[PDB]
Amino acid sequence: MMNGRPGHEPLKFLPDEARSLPPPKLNDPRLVYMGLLGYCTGLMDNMLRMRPVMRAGLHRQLLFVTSFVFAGYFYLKRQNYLYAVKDHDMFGYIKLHPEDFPEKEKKTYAEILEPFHPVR
Amino acid sequence: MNPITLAIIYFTIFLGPVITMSSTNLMLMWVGLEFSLLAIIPMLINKKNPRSTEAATKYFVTQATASMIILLAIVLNYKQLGTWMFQQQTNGLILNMTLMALSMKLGLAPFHFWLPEVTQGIPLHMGLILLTWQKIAPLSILIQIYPLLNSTIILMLAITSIFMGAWGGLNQTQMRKIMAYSSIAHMGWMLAILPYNPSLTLLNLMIYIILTAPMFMALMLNNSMTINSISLLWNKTPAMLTMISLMLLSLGGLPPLTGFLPKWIIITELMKNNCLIMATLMAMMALLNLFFYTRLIYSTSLTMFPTNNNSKMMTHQTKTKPNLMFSTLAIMSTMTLPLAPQLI
Amino acid sequence: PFLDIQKKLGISLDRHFMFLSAEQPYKNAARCHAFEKEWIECAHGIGGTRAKKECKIEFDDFEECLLRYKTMRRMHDIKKQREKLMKEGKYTPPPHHSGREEP
Amino acid sequence: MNLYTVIFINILLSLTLILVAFWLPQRLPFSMKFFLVAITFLLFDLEIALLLPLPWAIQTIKTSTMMIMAFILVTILSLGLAYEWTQKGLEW
Amino acid sequence: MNNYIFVLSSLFLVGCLGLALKPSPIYGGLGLIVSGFVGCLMVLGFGGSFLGLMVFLIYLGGMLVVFGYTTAMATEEYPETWGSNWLILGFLVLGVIMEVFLICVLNYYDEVINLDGLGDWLMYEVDDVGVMLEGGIGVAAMYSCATWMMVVAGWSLFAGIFIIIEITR
Amino acid sequence: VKRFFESYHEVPDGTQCHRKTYITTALGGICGIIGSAYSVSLNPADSTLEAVARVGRYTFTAAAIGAMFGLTTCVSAQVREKPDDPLNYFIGGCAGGLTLGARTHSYGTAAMGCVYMGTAAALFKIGKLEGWELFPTPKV
Amino acid sequence: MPSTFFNLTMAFSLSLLGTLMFRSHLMSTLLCLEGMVLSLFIMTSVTSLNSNSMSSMPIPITILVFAACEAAVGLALLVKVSNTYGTDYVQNLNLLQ
Amino acid sequence: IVELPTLEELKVEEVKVSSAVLKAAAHHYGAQCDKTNKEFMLCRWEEKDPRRCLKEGKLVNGCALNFFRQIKSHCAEPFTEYWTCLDYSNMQLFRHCRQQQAKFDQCVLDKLGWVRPDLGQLSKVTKVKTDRPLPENPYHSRARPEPNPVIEGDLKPAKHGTRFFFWTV
């Protein structure tokens, strides 16, 4: 799919081109989810290991909520780029090959005659 | 195992898939497959129980002949194109061989007989590696060659696997074999979308790995190879009963959990490509897989099976804990669905 | 390929020898080196989907340098007639088949 | 052909002898050690192969890489031997 | 003579037919040795000496000696089953003859066999005035030009010892 | 040796039943052979003959379901005069279901078989009528 | 090679038919398995030799080196089996049912 | 068609002397006649088609022929002794015959003045300028297909966000 694109960075995580895109707001609901996803991992661990669920490993709880979140910003930063490349790529083609994507014309509903199937 | 040997083997079992993935000269891809075959056989017979020798001798013969067939495809290509690698021009039969062969190493469809049996005689641990770090290698070879393979065969092996996996699983009561059967099924979905959108194969795999790896470390926490054995989970370790419940329903496609996404986007991609015949039948028997998953749910969680007095003794003793990976891979798996858009 | 740890690391342990036109030892050129070049400098920058229709002249030729089947055919065809003609006494190998020998 | 001529005379001479020789006159022995040796033998026999091209490879322009490669092969196999000794292997 | 390679190739096929019919393990081994020699001669016919002779060194006396060796301690005696060795012999002979006519049939389909073109294709091109163009010069790229091909194999052998000892243990 | 099967579709349904029945019978029979083969390779028999019999049983049963399907669908179409009607096929599919049922000596199977097989065949007709594509090439 | 590469290929298929239909002794398979590696080695060497592609001769041998160990593993499994069951016969290998 | 040149076009005189004779004098032929030799060779390499460089080739034989005629005129006896001894050896090795070599080489440095080229100084690459236009498009390469066009611009946050099922994103 998107691989084989000109300029592809053969093994890079997020090419610097992704600098042009806005950075993910740290409180983006998604990163906040990853946070909660993380807290739960922590709590779950405590549970499976039979420790006071919430009052234990308060250091770990932090490692978790802060590892998942850290991961998020840098992942979302990329997935956001990938999607952004997709448009660059998609929109460009629509133009470079314009005829294939012509802007057809839509008639007003007055002209169009849609068959009326009575409900009766 | 003399820890040195453990290192050499483990390195090979790990250099094996990695060479396959990194190289482009098919030959080097073949030896990557060959090294995986050689490295896995020692670990398979670690207990050296009579069942084990049977397991390895089957795994080895099935793996070896497939390896030879993959080499024949590379040897034939070399004469139809001087290149050592499949190209647009490749004779169709040349590629189909590679599909069958690689579908034997991965154990898909009508070649699904070896996996359930080797998964039954190997330890739970080596079971995981045999199921998930040995599927990465062959799949890599296929994903690389996707543009060229046949849409018809893959689909047939895909559908067959789904059915065989499901039907096989319904009867099985041994857990190792229930998982072996599930893997056949999931492996099927993966190979269904390969011709159309390889990138989704890599999602339907990771999710399978993030689902199966927690599931097996669960089976071994209590080292239960029987459902009856996993059913007394409520006494041995009560907390894992909650997540074991969700992970197994996640392995099947039920909608709130992470497991729906792989099936959902594979169905979306197949309908985008117009296989609304194939996709429909797959999704339907996919529902058979959940039936045997929920039957296990019943025994392990929703209903409490009777236990043994000697169990009270095992409770007393501190239970060696499950590694952290269980949690991080249980949650990222049971509930990431709210984050699907970025996964795909 | 699936994980390009080779391009990234810049190493080329597996690419230098994938085609017949790669560096052969002691520069002993392979056979069909006249074509594979012409068939891969053509398909460079043009993806496969379009290395399969328009760059078909160079593969149809490279499919014949190597396999060298059309030649085999033409030749085989020639012999057959020669056999039939030789039957009628029409063709008599010239002594050129056994003439002087050029240095 | 010249070799073929010699060899068939060679078989003929032997078949002649056995023929005249027959015409003129008118369950579980197993020790892993033995299997183990055979195996080691091929691991060494294969290595002999990877070492056989060394006469042509001597003339290789690189030289440094040649020796660096060859020395690594001989050393890693010898270590294989070393572990064979260390382990009960080679101790029959 | 021009069929020298077809014949050798033919005998190879038979040799393999034998192995396939699965005669007694040790006789089958004899079969792989016969095919082995035939094959070596094939490679030694297209101009490759090192590749061929290596087949002999590593595989004819080197590898199958092992096969025969192990087929000496662990494959029992093929006892009470020896009789088939005769039946298998027959099918083999019959199959050989079958193929004999079989290829005649394929030859009929001119649409490869190049019945007339036999001996015109064992070799295709040569550096007539060349000097260093001997099979082997290439096999040595393994030390210099291509070393990956050696580092991978080397690992195999090394790991092999550790693996076999571990399986055997 | 494929231009053949396809012929079934080329001539309008309900017409040239002879060909239809022949083609349908072959496909069933082919499936019979394949099915028997898997049935003999795995779950082997006791004696060569016993297995040859199996092969025959499965082949004939399958050939039969093939025939009646072909015959019923063709005839129904001709009689009902609906050249293209999914139901025609259903009648035929049901027929096959029943045959199979008989060869297995079970009324129940005939029930299972009548609906399921018929439905399936009907869907084939619809599929052809609506130009549904199976095993499609990737066109994304 | 046009028909000399069909004999070798059919040799590999005749060896294919062999490894896939077992009969009694397991050794006969392994042995058969090896018959393929020889056929592959011969075919790889043959085309490399008539393509004058010397850069590829490394492969004909890498194929053998990997195949030899592959077989080493195969035989150790075989010895392991006639140590647990006193025979190499495959029928014995039916516990995993 | 094939436009294969006609025989009359390729009928030129050649040395036609025993390999040994060429070998015995080779060192001096590499000396007295490389100006033209090279040219023919440079023609040969850059214009892969021999047919194109045939003329240069006729010049090659010729230059050598007189090279021989001059040898025939002077120090001929020496040369005769040197080749006869050189020919007897199976690989026609140069070192078995050094006493005979010294005579002829010495003589040609008295009568013809030509000199035996010191170890080397024949292997070194030569520069010969030739009128024949550097063949353009050797390999007769056809036109290279056009590279796919390039999507251009800078990235802008994706439109309306991931457009996955109901994800405002």
Swiss-Prot record, chain C:
Location of the region described as Disordered in the Swiss-Prot/TrEMBL record: 78-103
Compositionally biased residues, Basic and acidic residues: 78-90
Disulfide-linked positions: C32-C65, C42-C55
InterPro entries according to UniProt: NADH_UbQ_OxRdtase_FeS-su5 (IPR019342)
Localization of this protein: Mitochondrion inner membrane; Mitochondrion intermembrane space
Family: Belongs to the complex I NDUFS5 subunit family.
Protein name: NADH dehydrogenase [ubiquinone] iron-sulfur protein 5
Gene field: Ndufs5
From Swiss-Prot, chain D:
Cell compartment(s), UniProt: Mitochondrion inner membrane
Membrane topology: Multi-pass membrane protein
Membrane spanning stretches: 3-23, 34-54, 65-85
EC number from the UniProt entry: 7.1.1.2
Molecular function via GO: NADH dehydrogenase (ubiquinone) activity
Reactions mediated catalytically: a ubiquinone + NADH + 5 H(+)(in) = a ubiquinol + NAD(+) + 4 H(+)(out)
Assigned keywords, A-Z: Electron transport, Membrane, Mitochondrion, Mitochondrion inner membrane, NAD, Respiratory chain, Translocase, Transmembrane, Transmembrane helix, Transport, Ubiquinone
One Pfam family hit: Oxidored_q4
Gene Ontology CC: mitochondrial inner membrane; mitochondrion; respiratory chain complex I
GO biological process terms, semicolon-separated: aerobic respiration; cellular response to glucocorticoid stimulus; mitochondrial electron transport, NADH to ubiquinone; proton motive force-driven mitochondrial ATP synthesis; response to light intensity; response to oxidative stress
Role description: Core subunit of the mitochondrial membrane respiratory chain NADH dehydrogenase (Complex I) which catalyzes electron transfer from NADH through the respiratory chain, using ubiquinone as an electron acceptor. Essential for the catalytic activity of complex I.
Binding partners and assembly: Core subunit of respiratory chain NADH dehydrogenase (Complex I) which is composed of 45 different subunits. Interacts with TMEM186. Interacts with TMEM242.
Family of this protein: Belongs to the complex I subunit 3 family.
PANTHER family listed in its UniProt record: NADH-UBIQUINONE OXIDOREDUCTASE CHAIN 3
Protein name: NADH-ubiquinone oxidoreductase chain 3
Gene giving rise to this polypeptide: mt-Nd3
Swiss-Prot record, chain E:
Keywords carried by this UniProt record: Electron transport, Membrane, Mitochondrion, Mitochondrion inner membrane, NAD, Respiratory chain, Translocase, Transmembrane, Transmembrane helix, Transport, Ubiquinone
Main location, first listed in the record: mitochondrion
Compartments, as annotated in UniProt: Mitochondrion inner membrane
Segments passing through the bilayer: 1-21, 38-58, 86-106, 145-165
A Pfam family this chain is assigned to: Oxidored_q3
Catalyzed reactions per annotation: a ubiquinone + NADH + 5 H(+)(in) = a ubiquinol + NAD(+) + 4 H(+)(out)
Protein topology in the membrane: Multi-pass membrane protein
Protein origin, superkingdom: Eukaryota
GO biological process terms held by the UniProt record: aerobic respiration; mitochondrial electron transport, NADH to ubiquinone; mitochondrial respiratory chain complex I assembly; proton motive force-driven mitochondrial ATP synthesis; response to cocaine; response to hydrogen peroxide; response to nicotine
EC identifiers of the protein: 7.1.1.2
EC class (word): translocase
Entry's Gene Ontology cellular component terms: mitochondrial inner membrane; mitochondrion; respiratory chain complex I
An example Gene Ontology molecular-function term: NADH dehydrogenase (ubiquinone) activity
Keyword hit for Nucleotide-binding: no
Subunit-level organization: Core subunit of respiratory chain NADH dehydrogenase (Complex I) which is composed of 45 different subunits.
Task performed by this protein: Core subunit of the mitochondrial membrane respiratory chain NADH dehydrogenase (Complex I) which catalyzes electron transfer from NADH through the respiratory chain, using ubiquinone as an electron acceptor. Essential for the catalytic activity and assembly of complex I.
Family: Belongs to the complex I subunit 6 family.
Protein name according to UniProt: NADH-ubiquinone oxidoreductase chain 6
Organism: Mus musculus
Gene: Mtnd6
UniProtKB/Swiss-Prot annotation, chain G:
Bilayer disposition of the protein: Multi-pass membrane protein
InterPro entries per UniProt: NADH_UbQ_OxRdtase_chain4L/K, NUOK/Mnh_C1-like
GO molecular function: NADH dehydrogenase (ubiquinone) activity
GO CC terms in record: mitochondrial inner membrane; mitochondrion; respiratory chain complex I
Main localization of the protein described in the UniProt heading: mitochondrion
Keywords: Electron transport, Membrane, Mitochondrion, Mitochondrion inner membrane, NAD, Respiratory chain, Translocase, Transmembrane, Transmembrane helix, Transport, Ubiquinone
Reactions catalysed, as given in the entry: a ubiquinone + NADH + 5 H(+)(in) = a ubiquinol + NAD(+) + 4 H(+)(out)
The keyword Chloroplast is assigned to this record: no
Gene3D superfamilies documented for this protein: 1.10.287.3510
Bilayer-crossing regions: 2-22, 26-46, 58-79
Pfam family, one: Oxidored_q2
Location relative to the cell: Mitochondrion inner membrane
GO biological process: aerobic respiration; ATP synthesis coupled electron transport; proton motive force-driven mitochondrial ATP synthesis
Endpoints of the signal sequence: none
EC number, UniProt record: 7.1.1.2
Record carries keyword Translocase: yes
Matches recorded under PANTHER family: NADH-UBIQUINONE OXIDOREDUCTASE CHAIN 4L, NADH-UBIQUINONE OXIDOREDUCTASE SUBUNIT ND4L
Primary role: Core subunit of the mitochondrial membrane respiratory chain NADH dehydrogenase (Complex I) which catalyzes electron transfer from NADH through the respiratory chain, using ubiquinone as an electron acceptor. Part of the enzyme membrane arm which is embedded in the lipid bilayer and involved in proton translocation.
Quaternary organization: Core subunit of respiratory chain NADH dehydrogenase (Complex I) which is composed of 45 different subunits.
Record-stated family: Belongs to the complex I subunit 4L family.
Protein name: NADH-ubiquinone oxidoreductase chain 4L
